[PDB]
Design a protein around this ligand. Structure first.
Ligand code: ZN
Ligand code: ZN
Ligand code: ZN
Length: 88
DNA sequence: AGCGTGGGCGT
DNA sequence: TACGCCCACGC
């Protein structure tokens, strides 16, 4: 597809289809972290990454292993993916 | 293993 | 613009 939103930061060649995609990416350059955890006051560049971070404080693990007699659960989907891959 | 985080992707 | 899924990489 077409990607009209190009990043002009020094030595960056990243380009995107949407303007929010560019603005999100550019936070990696500036170090801006607009989202703060209300529990430990750590700051984050993104709201979705703040959300999964908060689960470290509560121990909430919404993603359970489907293998029989395996009670392993995880805070994020990608953790479960790696776990399921492990089970062969 | 647990999680920061960069990017794709949808709504 | 926001919101929050997924996937992968690299500690
Ligand atoms: Zn850039
Ligand atoms: Zn926190
Ligand atoms: Zn398992």
């Amino acid at each position: 597809s077409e990607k009209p939103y190009q990043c002009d930061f020094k030595d960056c060649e990243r380009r995107f289809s949407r303007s929010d995609q560019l603005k999100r990416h550019q936070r990696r350059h500036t170090g801006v972290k607009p989202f703060q955890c209300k529990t430990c006051q750590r700051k984050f560049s993104r709201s979705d990454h703040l959300k999964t971070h908060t689960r470290t404080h509560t121990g909430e693990k919404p993603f359970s292993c489907r293998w029989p007699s395996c009670q392993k659960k995880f805070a994020r989907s990608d953790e479960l993916v790696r776990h399921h891959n492990m089970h062969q």
